[PDB]
Design a protein around this ligand. Structure first.
Ligand SMILES: CCCCCCCCCCCCCCCCCC(=O)OC[C@H](COP(=O)([O-])OCC(O)COP(=O)([O-])OC[C@@H](COC(=O)CCCCCCCCCCCCCCCCC)OC(=O)CCCCCCCCCCCCCCCCC)OC(=O)CCCCCCCCCCCCCCCCC
Ligand SMILES: CCCCCCCCCCCCCCCCCC(=O)OC[C@H](COP(=O)([O-])OCC(O)COP(=O)([O-])OC[C@@H](COC(=O)CCCCCCCCCCCCCCCCC)OC(=O)CCCCCCCCCCCCCCCCC)OC(=O)CCCCCCCCCCCCCCCCC
Ligand SMILES: CCCCCCCCCCCCCCCCCC(=O)OC[C@H](COP(=O)([O-])OCC(O)COP(=O)([O-])OC[C@@H](COC(=O)CCCCCCCCCCCCCCCCC)OC(=O)CCCCCCCCCCCCCCCCC)OC(=O)CCCCCCCCCCCCCCCCC
Ligand SMILES: CCCCCCCCCCCCCCCCCC(=O)OC[C@H](COP(=O)([O-])OCC(O)COP(=O)([O-])OC[C@@H](COC(=O)CCCCCCCCCCCCCCCCC)OC(=O)CCCCCCCCCCCCCCCCC)OC(=O)CCCCCCCCCCCCCCCCC
Ligand SMILES: CCCCCCCCCCCCCCCCCC(=O)OC[C@H](COP(=O)([O-])OCC(O)COP(=O)([O-])OC[C@@H](COC(=O)CCCCCCCCCCCCCCCCC)OC(=O)CCCCCCCCCCCCCCCCC)OC(=O)CCCCCCCCCCCCCCCCC
Ligand code: HEA
Ligand code: HEA
Ligand SMILES: [O-][O-]
Ligand SMILES: [Cu+2]
Ligand SMILES: [K+]
Ligand SMILES: [Zn+2]
Ligand SMILES: [Zn+2]
Lengths: 47, 99, 121, 107, 90, 49, 65, 459, 61, 180, 91
């Protein structure tokens, strides 16, 4: 509904429509893949 | 301690590395050739042999997921049932409604 | 395992210790590190080991700190960042005692798993 | 992919039992900012800069041949700082092949 | 060749790969035809793909379905857990 | 071979967010069904000021 | 000539007049002023003040200062 | 002489010098923005002078893109080393090279003069009509600057393409990076000129393209048909630099040189056909949206190959070599930072995610991490690598671990919170905002003042 | 924001949940507003609450 | 040891800010009168006359260097005949202490080592395949989700009410059907 | 701070005459940097930033105490009803 202080709200917050829920879950679905892509690559940044 | 040394000696014997199957076309060292280089050469990283690497890496994987289970079953708690949803009176007026 | 199974023409050190040596060092001073593991003034060359006598391909490893402080030094004599320590002493120990290595790795992974799961959950 | 030059075992056989790998230092030396003399004028400071070029340095081996300062790209081959006119004589990229012609030889 | 290490193509099919220039052209053409076909044979076809009574049920679907059917879990899972909005206040 | 450690570390850290997402969906399914936070016949129009 | 071998020889040989550096920094400083001076001028033109007082476009407490 | 010089290396220095000068104006504008956004209220801009903020954000974007990063990465480093990498005496077109830098300066003077003399209003750096065509004369002046800049960009692109005719050595990856950017410019600029001329026609010639029965969405197609190729014209030279630095400093031959080259070519072709991911919320047809979303996600493949090829360049390098040099640190930092920016780009590429995140500060943080952090650091790293060849001094940068650490920490303090407020949500191109978004905005503002202070320590 | 309040309760019940909004100020003027009040709003708000109580009793009937 | 103390003597601290006296005390802007220095200023910098006002590239002081026979002066090598062979002794650069200052002693040892190359062609080819096709798999894993969510937004729904929203500078107009 | 002489796992390899060269020390010295007060201040500094980075400074809390007690009272008296552990949080 309205922004609240010091909230991460990663991927969205307070959906009030089925489409709004879809948007939040699409981001949540891809987020672990993004973490994998980052962690897997960064771990090899070294001599 | 006797069993500890037994399993330690059993693992050790099995893990001792065998000569690598070179995937590169290198010559055979001449016979009777000893150490020719020195320790001031650029350091070459010390790498575990495949069997040892699998063993320790597998112990690490078994460790992290058993740790995840320990946290889930002991440290964390399950949600109790949501409180009953009873009918409640809403506020009579919106605070911003003109009088 | 480069010296052990791959290449037989580089000098092979002896492990003095499977743990780093902690020493206080001063900027502007040059230190000489034992690369054979037989010096009695570890982690430094004592003037009587292989490194001091230039025997069998062993030579002292020159090192100089940028700033004063306490620095960790390699005892296993095979760390990639030798003379400084980067954890290769533990790695080389696991090669020599693979059963012990698994125990420590499981314990470390167990702690890491519990903490990360407890906080995120 | 490149994996170094190929070696035949015959080429790894020493002519003496005491042969080891030559321990020649390939650190060129201790350097810092090029330090000009106050007395030197613009012309003589130019000569000073030209005499401090690392890419003109080399290491002499036991047989008298020298391994020069080398780089992957020609950017490190010009004088530092870069002069107005750099490659007056065209730099030569040497390619190798097995072709030969009789005129080059004599019996 | 699709999802194929071309080192393998060079080894196992030496005669088909002899002309590497021609081999490259086929690589482009094959994948061009695949992309073109996807649009006009998987996406475009009109009034198709709406047979929802024919949802594929794989061997794994039935393994898990029968397991739950044998026990009461399948019945319990399908049961409607709540069909009222307000609980009764005592 | 080391790069595999990174794959496994990135698969563990990713799975943590999968579990959070999994629990999130369970919670969402219970909001409109049981959560007392969900209220109906509650919001009244404010009207023009 | 040896003096002409290097581009910008005086600067590279560390003999250049410092005024050249000062002009470069001054030019950058003037460039920066093109974002600040019109801000002050425009504020005064439409308000009468060169810069606002934080939250002076909102309701303030009696003791606010 | 100074202005008459045709030396390609001197002109390269001029490009870097001018980028820093114009950059001062760019950074100042950024400080104004962040100061204003520190809390809710008016802080340094009056409510009656809100048009100035709109102009500040517009000029910030335009100057940093076309007058700072592009002249620095495509004009500065390229004009200095490309003829050397090509083992050629000098650039193919000497006189054209001279006029290009003069043109850039003249267009900069026009822009800043328009700040001083014209009424200050803004329409974004994307100059969307009808807003751009109902504005005052400052918009006309900005259009003249862009067209003039376009002339310099195209002639410089022609100059680099001619190196293929004279190159006496091997086309290294970096040379390939510049050539492909030149191709991208030759194909994208003529379209930009056309749409800009149409903006002028509506502003100055009573044309009616951007009034009812004329589709305003037309502009966005032609603009972004240049817009997105521009973001790769700005990043590809940076990639070329990263390749040289990693190979040289690690003493390791580039791995997969041909894959690096073919990855750059691929990014260009794909980047020329994905522009409408900037137009997801306009209301395009379902199939168009799916095409563009699909092709946009494909760009990650070639971009990913380059990243992993860089990683193996740093892996295995000798430990004895000192790794604290600023150039090496910046090159490594680029890989770490670019992955963040690219991954967030893939997130916004999903159109349904984009509905929530369009015109929010998440987009800001996305392109800042790539440009304000990645591109800047790449240009710094490239100049630092060529310090001996260029010959500049009177700065403490070459070995300064404090500068690198402070820059990395504080730059992340600015833009990481901007990802959070993207799901809060705080729109872009605004100055006032709700009181519940102050915390994150305040943190980013503290980051901006700190970064500026660190820029003074280099001297 | 009913779903933020529900999800906070669910998370807190399961494990350790920490909110910055709970511990830190949300505005920077807090350093000066320790004793600040709007007395005109206080009187108006109290009056509206009194009227609301009368309306509630009437609605109860 | 402190290497700075070795060349401390060469570095005499300076007297003037920026290394020049006030122009009044000495006019460094004028051309030097010293013979053979007509192209230099008093402080040693090149004079504007030499570089700008009378630059040779503009046709001033025309003096073709090449002679009648198409030759220019060239300095020969240091030739040393020996052992029935003519040898050339190359010019070795001066000690880096002379040019840089530090005494060339106690230099750390950096041995010769040939380039650090990645080996095992078969293994490398597989990695490169993965460097390309692991991202390709991930993209393919997103493709199906992307299609579905796009189809969901563009779904023909049985809407029963319409609200028209017009955006004007700077307010939002709303048109709604009124109850009959 | 006159550190101690740690012999190590193999005491015979530390039994020689060090002379001017430094002697090995316990690992607590490395963590404390020989109990350097500035490194302790720097360590405390590292914690202070990291706490700001993740959870906020928490140094403003003593100043915010009165204004966090007013916010809590308002949420309880007039805010939307909180249930269970939710009542712990105030926004
Ligand atoms: C119960 C315990 C069971 C223990 C079984 C142990 C088996 C074992 O280790 O066999 C080794 C054993 C060798 O024994 P050895 O006596 O040490 O002989 C070694 C010789 O020197 C020479 O041997 P060789 O010449 O025959 O070659 C062997 C060598 C040849 O090695 C290679 O050529 C390298 C192989 C690794 C390459 C990996 C490449 C990855 C590239 C990634 C690229 C993409 C990155 C970016 C991705 C981005 C994505 C977005 O093999 C290895 O090094 C294998 C290493 C292990 C590979 C594991 C791959 C899967 C991951 C597994 C992780 C651990 C799971 C534990 C689970 C535990 C339960 C929960 O092999 C054999 O006996 C036959 C082979
Ligand atoms: C038993 C211990 C482990 C317990 C846990 C195990 C769990 C299972 C893992 C799988 C099985 C493991 C089995 C290992 C057995 C040993 C095998 C072996 O060969 O042993 C010898 C071998 C070493 O032997 P050696 O090579 O002979 O020499 C000894 C040396 O010690 C040489 O050592 P080294 O070089 O291998 O040292 C390891 C070092 C090597 O790697 C490095 O040092 C690389 C560090 C590069 C850092 C670059 C700067 C990054 C700054 C980014 C800031 C971004 C700010 C803005 C963000 C904006 C976002 C919007 O690893 C790290 O430092 C960890 C880096 C991990 C990735 C970092 C990135 C995390 C990102 C998290 C998500 C972020 C999301 C938001 C961002 C955007 C997302 C799209 O040991 C290992 O392989 C050790 C690996 C240890 C891994 C520990 C990972 C801990 C950190 C986790 C992530 C952080 C969050 C955690 C919560
Ligand atoms: C992003 C920032 C941070 C970056 C950090 C990272 C940096 C990393 C490193 C980057 C390195 C890049 C590569 C560097 C290569 C350098 C090569 C080089 O040195 O070339 C030699 C080149 C020239 O040396 P040369 O060969 O000896 O040249 C001899 C001359 O050709 C002949 O000598 P001459 O004496 O005969 O010269 C003629 C001279 C004759 O000069 C004089 O007679 C001067 C007399 C004194 C005047 C002083 C100014 C007075 C101002 C008064 C203002 C009054 C305001 C009143 C307000 C009242 C209000 C009520 O000048 C003129 O006649 C024309 C001057 C025109 C230019 C200056 C324009 C100033 C601004 C004008 C604004 C106008 C606005 C109008 C608006 C109108 C609106 C209606 O050097 C320079 O030009 C200086 C470069 C210095 C910096 C080099 C880089 C150092 C490293 C970076 C440091 C950080 C910089 C940060 C940016 C600046 C921040 C502010
Ligand atoms: C009734 C009427 C009837 C109808 C009549 C119709 C008539 C039609 C007429 C048509 C033609 C009219 C035009 C004639 C042009 C003639 C050109 C020509 O042949 O000149 C040969 C002539 C050759 O001179 P010379 O007689 O052999 O002797 C010259 C001296 O010895 C000096 O020797 P030098 O050349 O070696 O020294 C030059 C140099 C000497 O160097 C220095 O002064 C010191 C070293 C540099 C200091 C650091 C500067 C900052 C870094 C810049 C980096 C990028 C540089 C790029 C290259 C330079 C580009 C200018 O300094 C400068 O003069 C300029 C330096 C750069 C200034 C700009 C830097 C950025 C400042 C940004 C501030 C704001 C932010 O060229 C020149 O030397 C001067 C050319 C001046 C052109 C000025 C154009 C300015 C346009 C500005 C924008 C205009 C719109 C807005 C204006 C608003 C005003 C309020
Ligand atoms: C806040 C107050 C200040 C706290 C400072 C903390 C600094 C931590 C980062 C240091 C640099 C890390 C690094 O990359 O070291 C390279 C270094 C490689 O050789 P190096 O020559 O010693 O390092 C040169 C660097 O440039 C070293 O950098 P530098 O040139 O500035 O020299 C500083 C020197 C001296 O610095 C110190 O003495 C730092 C002492 C930190 C104590 C922290 C106390 C608590 C503060 C809160 O640092 C070291 O000797 C590196 C020690 C790294 C380990 C620190 C302790 C970790 C826990 C055990 O890596 C290590 O020794 C650490 C590897 C650890 C294993 C990683 C994989 C584990 C996977 C399974 C889990
Ligand atoms: C140089 C600058 C630059 C670069 C490189 C990019 C790169 C990318 N950008 Fe761009 N972008 C901008 C600058 C840039 N962008 C700017 C300035 C805007 C806003 C303009 C405005 O609106 O005014 C913008 C806007 C923008 C939007 C608009 C969002 C909106 O308007 O709401 C989108 C969405 O499609 C997008 C997507 C992408 C993608 C998908 C990439 C890809 O190139 C990213 C590719 C990189 C990776 C994917 C990471 C590396 C690869 C791997 C680690 C392999 C493994 C990863 C996977 C398998 C996914 N960008
Ligand atoms: C590459 C271009 C570039 C660069 C460097 C930056 C740098 C910065 N930008 Fe950026 N910014 C844009 C391009 C850029 N920006 C664009 C295109 C927009 C959108 C415009 C629009 O909305 O219309 C934008 C918008 C934008 C906004 C949004 C305002 C709004 O529309 O509401 C904000 C503030 O939040 C901001 C802040 C900053 C900050 C704080 C920095 C930096 O100050 C951060 C700190 C980094 C430095 C200070 C180093 C920079 C140094 C150089 C650039 C010189 C390099 C030269 C050499 C190396 C020779 N930018
Ligand atoms: O723009 O990506
Ligand atoms: Cu784009
Ligand atoms: K504000
Ligand atoms: Zn020894
Ligand atoms: Zn060790």
């Amino acid at each position: 509904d309205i922004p609240w202080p010091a909230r991460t709200d990663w991927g969205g917050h307070d959906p009030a429509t089925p489409f709004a829920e879809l948007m939040i879950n699409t981001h949540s679905m891809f987020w672990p893949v993004a973490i994998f892509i980052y962690v897997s690559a960064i771990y090899m940044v070294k001599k | 301690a006797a069993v500890r040394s037994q399993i330690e000696a059993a693992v050790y014997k099995w893990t001792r590395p065998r000569p690598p199957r070179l995937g590169v076309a290198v010559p055979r060292s001449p016979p009777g050739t000893g150490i020719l280089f020195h320790t001031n050469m650029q350091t070459i990283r010390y790498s575990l042999s495949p069997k040892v690497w699998v063993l320790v890496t597998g112990a690490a994987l078994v460790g992290v997921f058993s740790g995840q289970r320990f946290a889930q079953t002991v440290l964390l708690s399950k949600n109790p049932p949501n409180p009953p949803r009873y009918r409640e009176k809403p506020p009579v007026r919106h605070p911003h409604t003109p009088d | 395992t480069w010296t052990e199974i791959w290449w037989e023409h580089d000098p092979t050190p002896k492990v003095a210790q499977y743990r780093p040596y902690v020493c206080t060092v001063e900027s502007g001073k040059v230190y000489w590190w034992c690369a054979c593991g037989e010096s009695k003034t570890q982690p430094w060359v004592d003037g009587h080991c292989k490194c001091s006598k230039r025997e069998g391909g062993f030579r002292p490893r020159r090192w100089e700190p940028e700033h004063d402080g306490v620095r960790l030094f390699c005892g296993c004599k095979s760390c990639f960042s030798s003379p400084t320590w980067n954890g290769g002493c533990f790695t080389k120990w696991m090669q020599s005692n693979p059963a012990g290595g698994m125990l420590y790795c499981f314990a470390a992974a167990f702690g890491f798993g519990t903490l990360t799961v407890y906080r995120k959950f | 992919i490149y994996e170094g030059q190929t070696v035949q075992e015959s080429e790894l056989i020493p002519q003496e039992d005491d042969w080891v790998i030559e321990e020649t230092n390939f650190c060129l030396g201790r350097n810092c900012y090029v330090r000009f003399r106050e007395e030197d004028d613009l012309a003589r400071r130019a000569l000073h800069q030209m005499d401090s070029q690392l890419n003109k340095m080399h290491t002499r081996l036991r047989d008298g041949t020298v391994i020069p300062y080398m780089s992957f790209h020609p950017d490190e081959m010009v004088d530092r700082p870069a002069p107005i006119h750099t490659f007056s004589e065209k730099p030569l990229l040497k390619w190798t092949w097995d072709e030969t012609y009789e005129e080059a030889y004599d019996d | 060749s699709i999802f194929t290490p071309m080192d393998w193509m060079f080894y196992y099919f030496p005669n088909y790969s002899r002309d590497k220039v021609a081999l490259m052209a086929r690589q482009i053409k094959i994948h061009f035809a695949i992309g073109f076909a996807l649009v006009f044979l998987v996406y475009h076809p009109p009034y198709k793909g709406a047979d929802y009574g024919n949802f594929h049920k794989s061997p794994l679907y039935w393994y898990k379905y029968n397991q739950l059917e044998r026990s009461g879990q399948l019945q319990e899972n399908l049961r409607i857990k709540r069909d009222w909005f307000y609980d009764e206040d005592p | 071979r080391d790069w595999l450690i990174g794959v496994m570390l990135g698969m563990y850290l990713g799975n943590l967010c999968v579990q959070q997402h999994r629990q999130y969906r369970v919670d969402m399914k219970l909001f409109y069904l049981e959560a007392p936070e969900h209220k109906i016949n509650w919001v009244k129009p404010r009207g023009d000021l | 000539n040896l003096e002409d071998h290097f581009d910008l020889a005086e600067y590279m040989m560390k003999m250049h007049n410092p005024m050249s550096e000062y002009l470069y920094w001054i030019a950058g400083f003037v460039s920066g002023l093109h974002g600040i001076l019109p801000l002050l001028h425009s504020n005064y033109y439409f308000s009468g003040m060169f810069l606002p007082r934080d939250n002076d476009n909102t309701q303030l407490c009696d003791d606010s200062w | 002489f100074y202005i008459l010089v045709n030396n390609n290396k001197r002109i390269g220095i001029y490009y870097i010098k001018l980028s820093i000068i114009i950059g001062i104006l760019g950074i100042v504008l950024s400080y104004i923005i962040r100061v204003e956004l520190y809390n809710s209220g008016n802080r340094i801009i009056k409510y009656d002078n809100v048009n100035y903020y709109n102009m500040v954000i517009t000029l910030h974007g335009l100057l940093m893109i076309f007058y700072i990063i592009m002249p620095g990465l495509y004009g500065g480093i390229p004009l200095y080393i490309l003829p050397i990498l090509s083992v050629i005496t000098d650039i193919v077109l000497p006189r054209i090279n001279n006029i290009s830098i003069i043109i850039v300066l003249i267009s900069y003077i026009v822009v800043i003069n328009s700040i001083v003399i014209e009424y200050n209003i803004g329409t974004g750096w994307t100059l969307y009509p009808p807003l751009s065509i109902i504005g005052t004369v400052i918009v006309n002046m900005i259009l003249y600057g862009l067209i003039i800049i376009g002339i310099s960009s195209i002639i410089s692109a022609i100059n680099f393409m001619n190196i293929l005719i004279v190159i006496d050595g091997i086309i290294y990856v970096y040379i390939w990076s510049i050539i492909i950017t030149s191709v991208l410019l030759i194909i994208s600029l003529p379209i930009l000129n056309g749409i800009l001329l149409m903006i002028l026609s509506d502003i100055y010639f009573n044309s009616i393209y951007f009034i009812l029965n004329g589709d305003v969405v037309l502009y966005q197609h032609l603009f972004w048909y240049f817009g997105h190729p521009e973001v790769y014209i700005l990043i590809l030279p940076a990639f070329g630099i990263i390749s040289i630095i990693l190979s040289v400093l690690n003493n390791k031959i580039i791995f997969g040189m041909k894959s690096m080259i073919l990855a750059i070519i691929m990014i260009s072709i794909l980047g020329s056909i994905v522009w409408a991911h900037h137009i997801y919320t306009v209301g395009l047809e379902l199939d168009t949206k799916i095409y563009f979303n699909n092709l946009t996600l494909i760009i990650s493949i070639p971009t990913g190959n380059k990243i992993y090829n860089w990683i193996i360049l740093y892996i295995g390098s000798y430990n004895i070599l000192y790794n604290g040099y600023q150039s090496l640190i910046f090159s490594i930092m680029f890989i770490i930072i670019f992955i963040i920016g690219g991954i967030t780009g893939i997130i916004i590429s999903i159109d349904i995610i984009d509905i929530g995140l369009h015109d929010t500060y998440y987009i800001v943080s996305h392109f800042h991490y790539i440009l304000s952090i990645g591109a800047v650091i790449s240009l710094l790293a490239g100049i630092l690598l060529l310090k001996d060849i260029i010959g500049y001094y009177n700065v403490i940068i070459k070995i300064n671990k404090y500068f690198g650490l402070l820059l990395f920490i504080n730059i992340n303090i600015i833009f990481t919170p901007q990802f959070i407020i993207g799901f809060n949500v705080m729109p872009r191109r605004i100055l006032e905002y709700s009181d519940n978004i102050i915390v994150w905005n305040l943190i980013s503002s503290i980051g901006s003042i700190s970064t500026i202070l660190i820029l003074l320590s280099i001297f | 924001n009913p779903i933020t309040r529900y999800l906070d309760r669910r998370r807190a019940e399961r494990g350790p949940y920490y909110l910055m909004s709970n511990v830190l100020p949300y505005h920077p003027h807090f350093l000066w507003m320790r004793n600040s009040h709007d007395y005109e709003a206080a009187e108006a708000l109290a009056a509206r609450r009194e009227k609301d109580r009368e309306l509630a009793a009437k609605l109860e009937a | 040891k402190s290497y700075y103390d070795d060349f401390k003597d060469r570095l005499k601290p300076g007297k003037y800010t920026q290394g020049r006296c006030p122009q009044s005390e000495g006019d460094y802007r004028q051309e030097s009168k010293t013979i053979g220095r007509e192209h230099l200023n008093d402080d040693g910098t090149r004079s504007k006359r030499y570089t700008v006002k009378e630059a040779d590239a503009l046709g001033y002081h025309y003096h073709p260097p090449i002679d009648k026979k198409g030759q220019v002066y060239v300095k020969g090598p240091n030739t040393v005949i020996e052992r029935g062979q003519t040898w050339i002794k190359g010019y070795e650069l001066p000690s880096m202490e002379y040019t840089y200052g530090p005494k060339q002693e106690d230099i750390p040892f950096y041995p010769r080592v040939k380039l650090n190359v990645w080996g095992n062609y078969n293994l490398v080819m597989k990695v490169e395949f993965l460097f390309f096709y692991l991202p390709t798999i991930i993209v393919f894993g997103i493709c199906i989700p992307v299609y579905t969510i796009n189809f969901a937004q563009e779904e023909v729904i049985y809407t029963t009410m319409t609200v028209k929203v017009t955006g004007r500078q700077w307010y939002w107009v709303y048109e709604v059907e009124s109850p009959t | 701070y006159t550190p101690s002489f740690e012999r190590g796992l193999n005491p015979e390899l530390t039994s020689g005459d060090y002379g001017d060269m430094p002697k090995p020390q316990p690992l607590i010295d490395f963590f404390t940097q020989n109990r350097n007060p500035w490194f302790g201040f720097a360590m405390f500094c590292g914690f202070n930033f990291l706490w700001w980075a993740f959870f906020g400074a928490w140094q403003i809390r003593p100043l915010w105490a009165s204004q966090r007690k007013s916010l809590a009272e308002a949420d309880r008296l007039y805010g939307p009803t909180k249930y269970g552990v939710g009542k712990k949080y105030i926004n």
